[PDB]
Design a protein around this ligand. Structure first.
Ligand SMILES: CCCCCCCCCCC(CCCCCCCCCC)(CO[C@H]1O[C@@H](CO)[C@H](O[C@@H]2O[C@@H](CO)[C@H](O)[C@@H](O)[C@@H]2O)[C@@H](O)[C@@H]1O)CO[C@H]1O[C@@H](CO)[C@H](O[C@@H]2O[C@@H](CO)[C@H](O)[C@@H](O)[C@@H]2O)[C@@H](O)[C@H]1O
Ligand SMILES: CCCCCCCCCCCCCCCCCC(=O)OC[C@H](COP(=O)([O-])OCC[N+](C)(C)C)OC(=O)CCCCCCCCCCCCCCCCC
Ligand SMILES: CCCCCCCCCCCCCCCCCC(=O)OC[C@H](COP(=O)([O-])OCC[N+](C)(C)C)OC(=O)CCCCCCCCCCCCCCCCC
Ligand SMILES: CCCCCCCCCCCCCCCCCC(=O)OC[C@H](COP(=O)(O)OCCN)OC(=O)CCCCCCCCCCCCCCCCC
Ligand SMILES: CCCCCCCCCCCCCCCCCC(=O)OC[C@H](COP(=O)(O)OCCN)OC(=O)CCCCCCCCCCCCCCCCC
Ligand SMILES: CCCCCCCCCCCCCCCCCC(=O)OC[C@H](COP(=O)(O)OCCN)OC(=O)CCCCCCCCCCCCCCCCC
Ligand SMILES: CCCCCCCCCCCCCCCCCC(=O)OC[C@H](COP(=O)(O)OCCN)OC(=O)CCCCCCCCCCCCCCCCC
Ligand SMILES: CCCCCCCCCCCCCCCCCC(=O)OC[C@H](COP(=O)(O)OCCN)OC(=O)CCCCCCCCCCCCCCCCC
Ligand SMILES: CCCCCCCCCCCCCCCCCC(=O)OC[C@H](COP(=O)(O)OCCN)OC(=O)CCCCCCCCCCCCCCCCC
Ligand SMILES: *P(=O)(O)OCC(C)(C)[C@H](O)C(=O)NCCC(=O)NCCSC(=O)CCCCCCCCCCCCC
Lengths: 266, 75, 61, 670, 85, 81, 98, 107
């Protein structure tokens, strides 16, 4: 992923991170939950150790990644760890939160790949972070959408990313508390690499002295693909019922377990 | 240089050379006492520790509707 | 033991006072003169105290 | 009206920000200030409807998150605490919008600044009007995002970039603990609306209450800058001055205090969390009071004085005294904002200098600024019958009034903190106004005394006062700093006052101390703060301008030098945090990227396979010499091996071992 | 707009006139010299450079300080620096 | 003085010292829009608020003049004796 | 060398004293004492001892360094430094398609 | 690799190609360049870590000394705990919840 999601053309990257990562998640709801319930419950601690390790290791390496597209690619790894832990929670809110996070990741990673692999890359021909600084001064429209996208990546409330992270994290916590507590540290570290990357590119001084020419701001095309993606994350972050209402009944069918006075009615 | 014409950038050779070293560093990894110890610590020890802790506390606690006169412990 | 340089820490504080003669004396004299004398600086340290005191005395009768 | 309070500051913010080009500078200021002032009037009306008539108002609009047991609505509750919090937040925000019209008149980005000012107000209102924990968390993060934007407002400055990251990340550390506490509430009670949690709190498992209570205490620590998670707030002084008065002194720093008071029906049933609140507040009082005396920047002194007052509130919350915690929060917001705005007047008057070492004089140059700064300072030191007197001093005797060792200990601790509050309060007013001029000619050179000949019409810049928008808020906040505490103590304290009978604040009867505070506290310990205040002020004022060498003798002692440096360097926390936490994380990432992902994982993975298999492929291909006699022997040896394996009934494990051995040999060249 | 030539010279003129180590206040001109025209030793110049930076509220770096051996040189440095107040 | 800046940079918040000649006219429209939305929000609030105690007749409670719950109670309570 | 450094160390000595001594009049007495020390060593000419004389003074300024030395607002490390920095290039971007 | 020096230690007043980063254009960079420039964790140079540990310990030691003095000398409670008829038991939530002091063991 750190190779393919970076070397891909921009349209390839959007498809690869927005839809192709979601295949393994939808695959869990068809291939593990209904037919391997006993193995899934008995092995959740192995799944959770891997998911917990992935959340910390990917977060720390994202903080030290100097290719802008590679940094957005590595944050996908950290977010996918949370939906993977939510999908093995065997709780309604963890399972719905996993689907919610998967969807919210698709809008946010699409927007951040457009910002890096399509706006910065087309203008400079480079993907190295060392050459960017203070872009807000000359590109206010880019910095406005880039910031909102970086809040989505940090799971800021009013994005669908907070709703999915919260529900996924609650289910992971309730299934296995130590794994949820470590996974919760993502609320600190996703903010760290999102805010760090935003500050170094949009803020952090005047416009970079490596730019010989001045840069134009977003073209109408760039504006309206970012605006559309930002629209979906915010509207669904305020009314996530638009997806949850169509999720509740079917997602009930993949839960495994019983209550003592609720089961075996006569 | 990459399809569409981009803006003129003062591409600093030192920074470009640093970027090339990072892309090619995998070609020069070697097993040493230091690298083996670090790799073993990150890949085996820490994950197996979380795995052991997750194993031993699986099913230990439940909070739902626990009142005074009850225990969080289930096991 | 005395240092190679002739700096004594005890003597440094002994010379921490207003000098009898200073080559910059007239350049810095304005910082202590009329507007910035002790009296003028602290004259209005409690702005409305006199007016309040007079009014309070007239109220206490 | 109750919804109109919520949306009006948001509406102005989107016009100021997303249509600044349409309305310009003046249109942006007119719309935002108008939209905040109108909201403030409706807040005053709300305070009468809800608080004085004890009619809480519920409003629910649409559901936010609906999953089985969790139903979180976009819903707002107005109760006595809600309208109590809205009074300082709306009034100070209205006076800071107005003050900014003058203060930032020469800034090139007025529209964006006033949009941020109005967006912060809206997030604060959401935070206190929400009827459930998660909607409050939105305003909790809302104010955090607005704080990050306003600290980094001058974004070409690197140090303001570092400060904005510090505020965003440090608060996110407390956000992580608040999230787990919300998770613990959801896990135990099925959802997080306030009524449900507070109705079930007396019955839930006592260990569960501790987990939730400690979790929401740590979140409160970060937002209210208590000793553990305090470092961001002093660094937040990098923003423009009206931001410090509004966001980091009066309203957002009080969100942690609001969280504990709103959670009082739950945390009352946990003495553990109360005792941790009690000591944490006391530590924060002395910790910051010590540091602030050794600060060279006026905003940094004032920031550490905010941290010491917020500790007093948390201390009060630890004595089950939420009404007195709320009283101090409201009162402090008035006079501490006055100090910040008065400081901003000084910093404007002397061309942006912020160092005490270059002030002096100015007493005749900024008489109005000095007066209100003096009025605010007497409120801060709880001088008798000032506004701050009625809140702080009651907190102290309440600590004694709870006749316990912890209560007595915090009293002594907070008394020493009060001593150093007086010390740095003296330090500010004297070094700015009362001392000799340590700044240059330009600050004090007046046109009355002839100095220039041809450049006489201009070129004087004598460090004068500000304009109407700069000075009107000072006069208003000065009046609140004198009478507001007296006018309102019977509401917040009373003695059997029933202002909070909607259960906004819950005080369990076993936690009552107020009777003993009123009657059992000896008179000596009641007036002890005033004796200390009236004497160390004499001691401080005498040590300067009369002595002035003794402190110097202390400074140039090795003992004093080390003491001065330690407190000036803020207990070395930023040093130790940067060394062993921030740089520790960066080096962990460096190892992971270099030794594992671009290292061992490549060699014990694809890259090692590529190296070895290419070598293996080339060595096997060496056998293909195209010598027909050699292939003939190869067929023959293969024939015999097949004959041996079947004839001797060989163990299959032997055959696999043989194959692995053959790959081993073909691994080795030659 | 910014700083003018008349202002800086007058401010520097009163600065050097207040220094008792100047041989004669009547020797003070726009193109005066510290070493010969005014009679100032190595230490006195470092003290005057400190004074110039204090009056105009600016920091003069060491490399630039060496260049300021004349009243004219000081005025040029002050006019060049936008920050001086 | 005031800082120089590029005139080609378009920013929705205005840019550097932005004030159109028609700023009062534009401010008038937006303020009118703000009033219109606020009034709609006011109408929603006055219909959907919930109380469990009503104010006493002689007390200053201006919401009694627009909130549906209290208006119904006051109208019904006027039918006495 | 060996002259610029000494003159540099003279300014630093006076600045440090004023950093610790905020009162100018008290600092004035301090300032002449420090200068008097420089005069006592003006007649030294041996390079072997000259550079040793400079090494000791630097250590002295390390031993008594202020935790927070004064900086003018516009100086690097000052409060107003880099507050509203202008865009480095004021030319419009060249016509390119993106 | 050059020496791993944080650029905050470079001279601000040097004629830098990039004044903000205190860097000349083509000078060689360390591999940790991303965390060695101006926008990076500030290095505080007031005290070495061991001395700082000592000064922090002294404050804690001095703080604990005050607590011991307080523990030796803090007054006894000067009023009998307030009693409530019925212990407010019903209005505090019944026997399932916590109640008030009522003719209980003395304290
Ligand atoms: C931010 C944290 C702030 C600080 C929190 C402090 C909270 C304090 C509660 C700690 C707690 C809650 C953990 C729930 C976590 C839920 C999810 C996490 C949070 C989600 C948001 C963890 O307690 C667990 O710990 C386990 C080991 O760790 C133990 O299990 C095993 O231990 C080893 C074999 O015994 C094995 O080696 C290990 O393999 C096993 O597993 C058990 O002790 C227990 O299951 C419950 O503690 C409880 O311990 C018991 C024994 O005293 C107490 O009962 C007492 O017994 C009487 C005589 O004994 C006493 O007369 C009486 O007094 C009381 O009846 C309880 O009263 C309570 O105290
Ligand atoms: C839990 C782990 C928290 C770790 C979060 C930090 C992760 C690294 C983020 C990278 C920071 C980028 C940066 O520029 O740093 C500058 C910032 C600013 O630090 P600074 O103090 O060096 O900024 C300089 C300030 N002046 C200019 C005045 C000297 O560093 C951080 O904010 C990182 C700390 C995050 C908050 C951690 C609080 C400690 C919590 C203690 C209890 C646990
Ligand atoms: C959470 C995702 C987003 C959800 C909210 C979506 C926005 C809702 C409305 C927010 C209030 C209105 C914002 C006005 C925009 C600010 C001014 C502006 O136009 O910037 C352009 C300005 C233009 O500024 P300028 O007008 O001064 O132009 C000259 C300045 N330069 C030199 C830069 C050109 O660009 C910037 O300078 C800053 C770039 C970053 C913009 C910051 C984003 C503002 C919106 C923050 C979203 C708040 C989220 C709330 C937190 C979630 C709650 C948990
Ligand atoms: C922004 C405010 C948008 C106006 C919201 C009020 C309009 C309304 O009344 O719709 C409510 C409708 C039914 O309400 P419901 O969510 O089913 O549950 C109510 C529980 N309190 O529920 C809805 O359909 C609300 C849908 C909200 C969509 C908000 C999108 C915001 C875009 C910016
Ligand atoms: C009891 C304390 C008695 C102190 C007497 C009052 C001294 C006040 C001196 C003063 O006004 O100046 C403050 C000075 C720093 O201020 P500055 O502006 O830098 O220089 C002085 C300007 N005239 O401050 C100083 O540098 C010296 C002032 C005294 C500092 C020592 C007092 C604190 C020592 C630690 C006590 C707290 C630790 C014990 C408690 C632990 C917690 C329980
Ligand atoms: C009061 C109790 C102090 C016990 C004495 C501890 C001690 O010996 O510290 C000595 C230290 C000397 O300072 P130093 O820089 O090493 O002197 C240079 C001489 N060539 O001086 C110090 O370290 C004093 C430490 C002051 C800062 C400590 C933190 C605050 C303590 C609150 C009291
Ligand atoms: C899965 C774990 C494997 C990942 C890679 C692990 C590894 O260490 O690969 C390195 C290994 C040796 O590579 P090396 O020869 O040192 O490099 C060339 C130096 N000039 O590379 C190798 O040569 C490994 C060769 C493995 C060949 C496997 C053949 C499969 C057939 C199984 C037969 C079963 C009977
Ligand atoms: C799969 C591995 C297939 C290769 C197995 C042979 C490797 C052992 C070996 O070293 O024999 C190589 C031999 C050629 O002789 P060589 O040693 O290379 O010296 C040539 C100098 N001119 O070449 C041979 O011996 C080839 C023998 C062919 C028989 C294949 C046996 C398959 C395994 C049966 C079980
Ligand atoms: C600006 C500063 C505002 C600070 C607000 C802080 C809130 C806490 C302040 C506490 C002060 C309490 C109010 C003092 C005056 C109370 C009062 O009784 O005023 C009289 C007025 C009429 O009340 P009424 O009951 O009708 O009297 C006749 C009864 N037969 O009763 C009233 O309703 C008059 C008050 C009108 C409230 C709207 C004011 C809008 C501004
Ligand atoms: P002009 O001819 O007046 O000056 C000639 C100079 C002095 C520049 C020549 O450099 C020269 O003739 N001297 C040769 C170089 C030399 O030996 N320098 C001696 C003076 S510098 C030195 O090393 C001694 C400094 C002593 C005074 C400072 C000690 C530290 C005080 C710190 C106090 C800080 C506050 C507590």
């Amino acid at each position: 992923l750190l190779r393919a999601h970076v070397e891909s053309p921009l349209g390839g990257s959007i498809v690869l991170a927005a839809i192709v990562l979601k295949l393994s998640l939808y695959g869990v709801f068809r291939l593990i939950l209904p037919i391997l319930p006993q193995a899934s419950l008995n092995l959740t601690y192995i799944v959770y150790a891997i998911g917990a390790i992935t959340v910390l290791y990917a977060s720390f390496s994202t903080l030290r990644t100097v290719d802008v597209k590679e940094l957005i690619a590595y944050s996908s790894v950290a977010h996918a760890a949370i939906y993977l832990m939510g999908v093995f929670s065997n709780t309604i809110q963890g399972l719905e939160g996993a689907i919610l996070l998967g969807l919210a990741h698709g809008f946010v990673s699409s927007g951040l790949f457009i910002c890096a692999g399509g706006i910065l890359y087309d203008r400079t021909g480079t993907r190295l972070i060392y050459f960017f600084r203070g872009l807000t001064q000359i590109m206010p429209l880019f910095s406005l959408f880039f910031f909102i996208l970086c809040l989505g990546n940090a799971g800021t409330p009013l994005t669908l990313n907070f709703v999915g992270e919260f529900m996924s994290l609650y289910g992971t916590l309730e299934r296995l508390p130590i794994a949820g507590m470590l996974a919760s540290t993502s609320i600190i570290f996703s903010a760290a690499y999102s805010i760090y990357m935003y500050n170094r590119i949009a803020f952090g001084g005047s416009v970079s002295l490596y730019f010989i020419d001045c840069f134009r701001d977003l073209t109408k095309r760039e504006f309206f693909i970012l605006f559309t993606l930002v629209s979906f994350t915010v509207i669904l972050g305020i009314y996530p019922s638009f997806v949850l209402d169509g999720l509740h009944y079917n997602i009930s069918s993949v839960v495994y377990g019983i209550e003592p006075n609720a089961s075996y009615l006569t | 240089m990459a399809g569409l014409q981009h803006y003129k950038i003062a591409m600093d050779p030192a920074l470009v050379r640093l970027g090339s070293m990072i892309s090619n560093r995998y070609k020069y990894f070697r097993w040493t006492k230091r690298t083996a110890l670090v790799s073993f610590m990150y890949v085996v020890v820490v994950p197996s520790t979380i795995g052991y802790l997750a194993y031993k506390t699986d099913g230990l606690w439940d909070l739902r509707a626990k009142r005074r006169g009850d225990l969080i412990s289930e096991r | 033991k005395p240092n190679i340089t002739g700096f004594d820490m005890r003597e440094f504080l002994r010379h921490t006072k207003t000098p009898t003669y200073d080559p910059w004396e007239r350049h810095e004299a304005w910082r202590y003169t009329g507007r910035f004398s002790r009296f003028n600086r602290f004259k209005g340290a409690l702005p409305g105290f006199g007016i309040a005191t007079v009014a309070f005395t007239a109220y206490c009768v | 009206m109750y919804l109109s309070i919520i949306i009006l500051p948001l509406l102005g913010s989107v016009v100021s920000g997303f249509f600044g080009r349409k309305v310009g500078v003046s249109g942006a200021q007119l719309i935002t200030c108008s939209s905040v002032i109108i909201t403030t009037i409706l807040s005053i009306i709300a305070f009468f409807e809800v608080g004085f008539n004890n009619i809480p108002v519920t409003i629910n609009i649409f559901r936010w998150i609906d999953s089985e047991w969790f139903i979180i609505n976009w819903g707002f509750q107005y109760d006595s605490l809600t309208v109590s919090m809205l009074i300082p937040v709306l009034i100070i925000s209205s006076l800071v919008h107005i003050y900014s019209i003058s203060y930032m008149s020469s800034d090139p980005h007025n529209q964006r600044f006033f949009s941020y000012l109005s967006l912060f107000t809206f997030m604060m209102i959401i935070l206190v009007t929400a009827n459930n924990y998660l909607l409050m968390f939105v305003g909790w993060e809302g104010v955090g995002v607005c704080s990050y934007l306003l600290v980094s407002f001058w974004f070409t400055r690197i140090a303001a970039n570092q400060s904005s990251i510090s505020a965003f990340l440090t608060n996110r550390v407390g956000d992580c603990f608040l999230t787990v506490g919300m998770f613990a509430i959801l896990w135990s009670l099925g959802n997080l609306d306030y009524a449900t949690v507070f109705s079930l709190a007396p019955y839930i498992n006592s260990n569960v209450v501790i987990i939730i209570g400690i979790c929401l205490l740590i979140g409160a620590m970060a937002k209210s800058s208590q000793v553990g998670l305090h470092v961001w707030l002093p660094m937040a002084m990098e923003g423009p001055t009206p931001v410090s008065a509004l966001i980091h002194a009066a309203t957002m720093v009080t969100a942690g205090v609001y969280l504990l008071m709103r959670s009082s029906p739950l945390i009352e049933y946990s003495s553990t969390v109360l005792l941790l609140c009690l000591w944490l507040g006391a530590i924060t009082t002395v910790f910051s009071s010590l540091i602030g005396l050794f600060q060279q920047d006026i905003k940094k002194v004032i920031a550490y004085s905010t941290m010491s007052q917020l500790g007093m509130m948390v201390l009060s919350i630890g004595l089950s005294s939420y009404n007195i915690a709320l009283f101090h929060l409201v009162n402090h917001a008035f006079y501490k904002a006055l100090l910040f705005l008065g400081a901003g007047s000084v910093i404007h008057a002397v061309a942006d200098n912020q160092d005490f070492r270059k002030f002096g004089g100015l007493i005749s140059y900024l008489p109005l600024t000095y007066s209100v700064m003096l009025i605010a300072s007497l409120s801060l030191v709880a001088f008798p019958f000032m506004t701050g007197f009625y809140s702080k001093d009651f907190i102290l005797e309440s600590a004694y009034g709870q006749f316990s060792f912890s209560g007595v200990a915090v009293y002594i601790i907070a008394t020493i903190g009060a001593i150093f509050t007086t010390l740095y309060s003296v330090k500010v007013l004297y070094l700015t106004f009362l001392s000799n001029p340590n700044g240059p000619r330009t600050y004090y050179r007046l046109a009355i005394d002839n100095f220039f000949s041809a450049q006489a019409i201009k070129s004087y810049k004598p460090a004068h006062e500000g304009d109407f928008f700069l000075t009107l808020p000072l006069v208003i906040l000065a009046l609140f700093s004198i009478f507001f505490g007296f006018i309102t103590k019977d509401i917040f304290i009373g003695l059997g006052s029933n202002f909070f009978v909607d259960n906004s604040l819950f005080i369990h009867p076993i936690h009552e101390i107020m009777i003993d505070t009123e009657f059992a506290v000896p008179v000596l310990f009641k007036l002890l703060p005033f004796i200390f205040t009236i004497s160390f002020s004499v001691i401080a004022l005498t040590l300067s301008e009369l002595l002035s060498e003794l402190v110097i003798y202390f400074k140039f002692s090795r003992f004093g030098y080390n003491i001065f440096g330690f407190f000036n360097q803020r207990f070395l926390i930023e040093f130790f945090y940067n060394k062993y936490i921030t740089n520790l994380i960066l080096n962990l990432g460096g190892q992971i990227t270099k030794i594992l992902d671009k290292g061992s994982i490549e060699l014990f993975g694809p890259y090692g396979l590529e190296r070895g298999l290419v070598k293996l492929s080339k060595n096997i291909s060496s056998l293909s010499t195209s010598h027909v006699t050699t292939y003939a022997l190869y067929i023959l040896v293969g024939f015999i091996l097949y004959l041996i394996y079947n004839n001797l009934l060989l163990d299959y494990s032997y055959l696999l071992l043989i194959i692995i051995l053959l790959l081993l040999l073909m691994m080795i060249g030659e | 707009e910014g700083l003018q030539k008349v202002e800086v010279y007058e401010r520097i003129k009163s600065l050097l006139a207040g220094f008792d180590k100047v041989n004669d206040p009547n020797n003070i001109t726009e193109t005066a010299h510290f070493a010969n025209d005014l009679g100032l030793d190595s230490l006195d110049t470092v003290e005057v450079v400190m004074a110039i930076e204090e009056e105009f509220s600016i920091e003069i770096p060491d490399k630039d300080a060496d260049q300021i051996h004349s009243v004219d040189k000081a005025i040029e440095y002050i006019l060049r620096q936008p920050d001086a107040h | 003085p005031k800082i120089p800046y590029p005139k080609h940079v378009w920013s929705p918040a205005g840019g550097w010292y932005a004030q159109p000649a028609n700023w009062k006219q534009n401010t008038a429209i937006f303020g009118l829009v703000i009033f219109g939305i606020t009034a709609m929000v006011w109408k929603y609030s006055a219909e959907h608020e919930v109380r469990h105690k009503m104010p006493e007749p002689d007390r200053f409670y201006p919401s009694r003049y627009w909130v549906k719950q209290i208006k119904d109670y006051e109208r019904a309570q006027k039918e006495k004796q | 060398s060996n002259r610029q450094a000494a003159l540099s160390l003279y300014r630093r000595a006076l600045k440090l004293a004023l950093d610790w001594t905020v009162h100018r009049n008290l600092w004035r007495g301090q300032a002449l004492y420090i200068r008097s020390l420089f005069e006592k060593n003006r007649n030294v000419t041996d390079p072997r001892l000259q550079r040793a004389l400079l090494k000791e003074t630097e250590k002295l300024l390390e031993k008594w360094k202020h935790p927070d030395p004064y900086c003018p607002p516009t100086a690097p490390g000052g409060s107003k430094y880099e507050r509203n920095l202008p865009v480095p290039n004021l030319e419009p971007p060249p016509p390119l398609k993106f | 690799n050059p020496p791993r020096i944080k650029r905050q230690f470079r001279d601000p007043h040097a004629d830098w190609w990039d004044k903000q980063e205190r860097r000349n254009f083509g000078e060689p960079v360390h591999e940790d360049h991303d965390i060695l420039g101006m926008f990076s964790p500030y290095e505080y140079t007031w005290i070495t870590p061991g001395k700082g540990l000592f000064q922090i310990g002294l404050f804690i030691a001095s703080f604990l000394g005050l607590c011991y003095v307080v523990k030796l000398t803090y007054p006894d409670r000067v009023s009998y705990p307030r009693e409530f008829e019925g212990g407010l038991e019903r209005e505090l939530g019944g026997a399932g919840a916590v109640r008030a002091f009522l003719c209980l063991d003395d304290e």
